[PDB]
Amino acid sequence: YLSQPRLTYKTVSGVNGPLVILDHVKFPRYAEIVHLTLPDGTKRSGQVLEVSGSKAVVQVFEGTSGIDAKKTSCEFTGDILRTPVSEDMLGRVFNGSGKPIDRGPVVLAEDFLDIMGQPINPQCRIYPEEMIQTGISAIDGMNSIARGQKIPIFSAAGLPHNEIAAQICRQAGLVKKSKDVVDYSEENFAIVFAAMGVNMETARFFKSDFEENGSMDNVCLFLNLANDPTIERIITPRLALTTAEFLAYQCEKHVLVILTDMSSYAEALREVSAAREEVPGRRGFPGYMYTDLATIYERAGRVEGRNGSITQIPILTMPNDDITHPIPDLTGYITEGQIYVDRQLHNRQIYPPINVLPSLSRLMKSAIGEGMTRKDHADVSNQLYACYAIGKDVQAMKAVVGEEALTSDDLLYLEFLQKFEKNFITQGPYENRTVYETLDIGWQLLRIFPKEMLKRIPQSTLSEFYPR
Amino acid sequence: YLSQPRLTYKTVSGVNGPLVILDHVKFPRYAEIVHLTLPDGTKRSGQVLEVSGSKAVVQVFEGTSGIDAKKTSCEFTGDILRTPVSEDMLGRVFNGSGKPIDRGPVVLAEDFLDIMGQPINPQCRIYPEEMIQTGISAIDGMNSIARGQKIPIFSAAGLPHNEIAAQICRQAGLVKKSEENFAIVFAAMGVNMETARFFKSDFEENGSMDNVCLFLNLANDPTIERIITPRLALTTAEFLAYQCEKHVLVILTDMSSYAEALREVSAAREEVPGRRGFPGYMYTDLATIYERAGRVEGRNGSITQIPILTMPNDDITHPIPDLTGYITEGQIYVDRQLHNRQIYPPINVLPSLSRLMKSAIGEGMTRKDHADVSNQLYACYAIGKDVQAMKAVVGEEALTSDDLLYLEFLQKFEKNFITQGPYENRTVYETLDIGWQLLRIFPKEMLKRIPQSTLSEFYPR
């Protein structure tokens, strides 16, 4: 460990927006933390990014203002960024920089960890099999998820995704309720939440919701407003992810990370790239943002020899309700699945307006079946899905021509669409439904058709369950 | 007053496109004017655009050609461009750069004014509300233009916008009824000389060439002086308005060529592009061209602009029409479909709009029923167009009586109201009576845009 006095320089050679270029620094370190002292005396921090001979550049996490070519000092610790982390972080609140904001004490660290963390060896990773209860009807049964499974939430401006996040974080539970309840109740879910580029109103809505739940015994909150500087957002997610790693792989608990507004992260990275004059990719975003999103989306899954788990549940906004926009596409190439909250459903006041049609959850493949959830599950979702798609086709054909050309089968499809939207989609504010109930509701929605119409269902299962 | 002898440097360190760089230049004066002596002796001119260190980039009004880095010379004025202004210039003709065309002399220049002009104090503005007599029913009554306003006309190739300009500059008057007259100002913008000849002939047709400040510029002339010409014309208008107590009917033409020249200059200067590749500061440039208008306290004069422009591909979302719409209040939008229907004056009444109804009309000026008549007519025309679109497919059989009434009203509106003719000046009262006669076809019940009192008062005739 380092056992030498710190070092200080004063040669400042320019400021280019959120960057500060400087000269005559001996033996610097790439990715090294720098402190700053202003003429007025305030303190600041930064990160060395570029290095070339004696000249080096940094990035002030809180912007540049009042800096001077000769009346500002800088200090090089000659060490990679080491963050503090303890189990005591539960129940606390902080800003992006990690300093307290809720009047509480300074951080009292249990250990120093690396911001970049480390690349986990894939062989230790245990493939998830548990299927987590969500309470939501659209996610359970149809696009379910697992413990350790990283799923995003696609949404847009003005959509009510915030309370969807509230619901999914509040109604967390396990679906293995068919056994003794006492051993079931031992399990809880530590939550770590990292606001980022989020206005005051949504932040207070979330903290009031958490206070209503009374779950601050196991909630860590990192906060960011709009008025704060922008470059904090470059490092804000990583702090939360590292703390989640420590709370999972060392404290043995089950953690659930929440990330907010990744398009803001992309915007901040693009701003840094615009300052850094590197080669721009499509829509001006740097080429290596793919690898950056990879590095921030891989800290998930459980590991051998332990029993904790890490589930990634980010939310991101699509400008102009676009799907081929860069950030949605690249996130689709990193994350395994999608949800696609839709504006059209929200226009007719259906809450939550979850569009099942473009959704996907690959890891449903082995997360369901006899013993896990129910003998007869997947084909029900497939039949409902194909019926929904064909019903939407019939709806389009009705729009093009009119009800005159529709057959009786088309009428059956249309009433299926109506009932499907009315019952299965619409749930309500705090309607915590069970898995068996949603399966029963699916069977109910299937009942309207006779045996002949269904095509993607085994006849044995139909004879087993349909006649009741 | 400048008792400083002039300078001249031969250090031409380069030429790239329409730009020229001068090294070892001593203490550059920004936004300067310089003169150039070609080796064969021809004179040229330009303005200094950029300065940095002992270097000075300079753009040439007439365009780079023949310049030699070792033989040519350049001399420095030390003052921003100042143009000669004069009240006796009326009845004369000059090119874009201002030199005489009719074998006239160098103008005796009552003063030297800044080409770039100066802004106007906000608090020193007075709102204009006097209605102008145009003689066109589609303007007087629907899109009435008042003094101190800058309505353009959006026209495409082959449209009779030139004749509309002729009519508006010929039948100018005052609605509110000593003598009156409008000091015409006009500058061409590279238009083909046939239109210039037609405008000249019509201006003698007016019979008041003594009040015709004219400027010219043809397509074959250098493109880049088109950036200067309108500013010179506007300076002349400023001088004749706020120094001689005169009203000036400033009119321009073919702003698309101006936009193209500015685009070429910007491309040569590799600035950050915008929509369709246009310059970013095209908006601010257009602002400096247009907002120089109105009338101020302590002066009875006023400035009226009619900057007609070309409209490529008849596309409303094309940037030049869009930005011109933002910077101004009103529009006319002569129609291609009407001209193909063989009707004159072919002005589409619906897309047009004037924002000065708020004070130009009303009781004490024209009448207490002008605004509601116009609103009712607009609504009836729009719904007539909609039912026409419906009839285009549905067929007359499934329609109702209201639909046939609306179609007949539309037919009457087009055959009578719009049809005005080339030399038949009409009064405001006649247009109001014609509109009332048109509206009489509908019974009173379905008139949803007229108050009860006016409807009872005027309808039963």
Partner: peptide, 18 residues
């Protein structure tokens, strides 16, 4: 195209540092 042109010119002027 404009963005690529700008960065190419930037690289060029950087090349003529000496």
């Amino acid at each position: 195209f404009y963005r690529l042109k700008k960065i190419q010119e930037k690289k060029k002027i950087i090349k003529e540092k000496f």
